[model samples]
Target: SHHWGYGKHNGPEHWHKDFPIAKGERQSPVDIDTHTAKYDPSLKPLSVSYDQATSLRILNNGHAFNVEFDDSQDKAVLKGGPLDGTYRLIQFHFHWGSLDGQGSEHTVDKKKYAAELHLVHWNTKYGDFGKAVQQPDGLAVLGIFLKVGSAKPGLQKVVDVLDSIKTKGKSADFTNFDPRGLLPESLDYWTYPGSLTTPPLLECVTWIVLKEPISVSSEQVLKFRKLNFNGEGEPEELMVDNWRPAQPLKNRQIKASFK
Candidate 1:
């Protein structure tokens, strides 16, 4: 297996050594310069369809915490917002800081949020997620920024379960939760073609990053900070500031769903 962890020896900056696409033309978390972004009216309103509870469990994969979803069927999906087809919601995860006021992977006008959320979805036409990853437009990910403020009720459910999945390979039964619960009031977003923020750094993702960010109290984020990079038996590895730096925009023009 490939070893890639976020730290001084092996982190975002060093990832290119193992995964060259890390420096590819269409890399993700690109610095979103609002002044230059073009607004397109043709983009459709963001549509997410989650018929019922789709969340399965939350796991600490060492690199990040991912809450897997039941993507076996099209019961839960994401459509519109620069997409030509429906993409199934596969999982949702976060990137945060050990201390406060840091940890987001993307920057807005050079400003970073306290944390960032990623709702990963796979295009339905390509079949399952395994096959979808190989197509350019096969995957769509919704990014929601998290700012520290009042305790966000939506995050309470997620924070309550983090303690159980604190170490790598740990997962607890986390069901009945809707992914939309953590969304901001407005769906206005910046759309672009990018890759996965982490390992494999696949270039198949169609990014829809929301403009308005969700709020989280200091109490809530500390729960996420409690995660460990090491396993239950390892010495220790504190989980915090897990984020990749902004990649070059190159010739790409980031579009806005709203003006």
Candidate 2:
């Protein structure tokens, strides 16, 4: 088995060979046909509570940069909105395009955003992440689209640190940052049962993708592109277009929070 990355020889097209579930019924990052999404009144509104002290550090794990949190306890958690219990926040990362026109994984009616953000959490009922990710109802990931526009003060803090960890496997101590600042004003979303968009490709995530997008200045997106897929002195391949294209929506139904 060789390494899996966003390259011609190891990208999403070849994932099914290693992670067989890549072709499963519940694979994620599906294209949401906005017109087909049904409005659901029963789905409760989402609630997020974050303890800034829980933020630990940020790192570049080759695929993308992530800001990890201390999830030993329920310091930051997400509840409501199709979730049966509280899901503890683990980490968050972004996927972007080489250019501003396209990048998002889960597209809306064939339209891709400049980038996408995934805030990952695991259900407490399953004990820990290792155990939680195995069950169908154990994980919940909030997906937010990033549009190109005015500079976002909340996102700037994260973008500003990209330079320090530009290469793969680099990490820096990043703390005192509350992730709630990155959320869009609207909590309305589309919910569906799906798998993780990455390798291992487990079918445990209850995806709650937000309807509205947050603004990320064009300059900020450029900073993200400066990150490298290759580590130190490895020919320097810039990390761009790390997003997986939308997958097929087989026998699944997408529920909308708004009419």
Candidate 3:
């Protein structure tokens, strides 16, 4: 089971204790407002391919669907694959807040969103997900910020599946669901060398945060808050906020590419 400490008091400060690297020189949730075009040249362009045969498996692990990927069993959308390496799907999940706003880790101009979704991938060149985590540039996370707005065309696919896993410690079977369908159409992004926002905070990640955020209806954002840790054969605590606070940029420069 994947243990997420976002709901605990103190939020990210507490979560960082579990993943020591969260205190490292380079961390996520950087203030994009401070970013400038001068440093944008360092951003690496990405190329991704979507896999149709790829399947999404939801686990009943404590949080929610802790997906596990089967490289041999599924096809994948290769984003920045050819250049970075033949990376394969691992798992993807979300972090939401109890309220209508404030869930995403990274904020633009100090603006917090309703939630954030992370699609984690590992470089196949490192042999596999386990081995890849050991390398300096082994992991790449595609971060998509979610805000409350009119119904998002890209998010409707996942929102449709929420009812299936409405209760805590419960998950539904999801197949033939294209994970790539959830991604925003724009590819412009910010990239930097950083560590995992979760525990064991290894500094092996290269974060690619999309400039364009996807939107969801107010109801969709509420669905996440409505999730409860209390249910038939479940804990009494409700699953309200599951988000980490922004970390220091540590004098590191974030690069972006749209040119």
Candidate 4:
């Protein structure tokens, strides 16, 4: 597969060269229909608690938002809220297409969704985020799929803030924005060991892909694609398609806690 980047060398086909593991491992873009459920009857859903200090910071690098939570202060309520071990909120971002048809990194049965959201967290039990990124199971990503459909109430909260950060390097003050509100009511998800879809191909991630996808109006999906890179010091083109094609799925099994 390829490593994701801005140039021609960037994409799924070029990634294996960047990381040796990509050569031998099963990557994403797996056919969800191909797998049989390894349902865990006793497994419970994961839950998290939001604190007042939970803040959203947008990075000028690629218009990505890093949502930092005071995990040290807030208490997780569900069984695996804190994960099996101690992890801290690192950041969150989205991958979308330039046009309406092609931005999501993962597809189900060869069908691409509208967009994908990644909630990246690192295991604080190891050390800081930097050190944690090196260990297996050091990172956990909460994956949410967005499909074009009727306007969803959950998405309205996010769309309302888009106007504030319409341009690159232009981020607004987002307060009273609840990250939990972005999550769907369904906690059922598929879990697997995977690598970062981006560069370095770090195979230190445990992905929890939500079974139930979130819905957004077609207008909301278009607004995201219309985003352009901030023209500042560099001549980088405006943010267009920032999604990598799905990688190969080696013989790995994707497990779901619910049916």
Best candidate (score: lDDT): 2
**Candidate 4, superposed: residue stretches over 4 Å from native:** 1-9, 16-21, 24-29, 51-53, 63-83, 153-172, 233-238
Considering every candidate listed, which one attains the maximal TM-score? 2
Model 2 whole-model lDDT (C-alpha atoms) = 0.93
Per-model C-alpha lDDT, please?
0.89, 0.93, 0.68, 0.64
lDDT of residue 152 for candidate 1: 85
10 residues in a row with least lDDT, candidate 2: 47-56
The TM-score measured for candidate 3 stands at 0.84
Candidate 1 residue-wise lDDT at 127: 91
Compute the lDDT of residue 178 as modeled in candidate 3. 66
List TM-scores for all candidates, in order. Answer: 0.97, 0.98, 0.84, 0.81
> Model 2, 1-259: lDDT tens per residue?
4788888999999999999999999998999998999999999999888754378899999999999999999889999998998999999999999999888999999999999999999999989999998899989999999999998888988999999999989999998888988999999999999999999999999999999999989999999999999899889999998988988899999999888
What digit string (tens of lDDT, one per residue) describes model 4 on residues 1-259? 4324554665456666666666657455455552564776655567554444365554434534344444553332222732586456666677777665666776665677778888777776776667877888788787888777877775565666665655556666554556676677787787777777776667788777887778778888776665555535655455656776766666777777776
Candidate 3 residue-wise lDDT, 69-112, digit = tens:
56753366445521366667777878777776687877787888
Which residue pairs clash in candidate 2? none
Higher-lDDT candidate among 2 and 3? 2
Q: Candidate 2 at 8: error in angstroms?
A: 1.1
- Model 4 local distance difference test score: 0.64
